Amino acid sequence: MKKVINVVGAIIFSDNKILCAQRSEKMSLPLMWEFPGGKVEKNETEKDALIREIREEMKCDLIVGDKVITTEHEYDFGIVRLTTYKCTLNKELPTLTEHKSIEWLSINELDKLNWAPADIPAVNKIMTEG
Numbered sequence: 001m002k003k004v005i006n007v008v009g010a011i012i013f014s015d016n017k018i019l020c021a022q023r024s025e026k027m028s029l030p031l032m033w034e035f036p037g038g039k040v041e042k043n044e045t046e047k048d049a050l051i052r053e054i055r056e057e058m059k060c061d062l063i064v065g066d067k068v069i070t071t072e073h074e075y076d077f078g079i080v081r082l083t084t085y086k087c088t089l090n091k092e093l094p095t096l097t098e099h100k101s102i103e104w105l106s107i108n109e110l111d112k113l114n115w116a117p118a119d120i121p122a123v124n125k126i127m128t129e130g
Contacts, residue, residue: 071118
């Protein structure tokens with residue numbers, strides 16, 4: 001009936017800052033902002049998709065904590081399910097980070113990076129940490 005679009009994002013934390021990666025027009029509201037990644041295979045899970053991709057794609061030891069939140073929306077070409085996963089900073093720097101530019105906002109400033117409607121509620125949770 002509908003095409004279940006499985007996509008997973010990555011949120012690297014470091015010094016109370018967040019990374020930015022303005023992908024193509026495929027991502028969610030990539031015009032204003034957008035996170036790195038956001039693609040899952042039809043065999044791998046939202047998590048396995050990160051541990052696998054981040055492996056070669058990022059070519060780093062990016063560590064993962066736990067699932068942030070699950071968001072889904074009704075699309076014409078199926079259903080878009082955006083999910084975030086708490087990541088950690090490693091020795092080497094992340095990849096595809098220079099895509100848009102170098103900007104690290106604080107936890108109480110991330111709001112300025114108005115993200116998609118699926119990540120919006122996922123980013124707000126972070127603030128809870130304080």
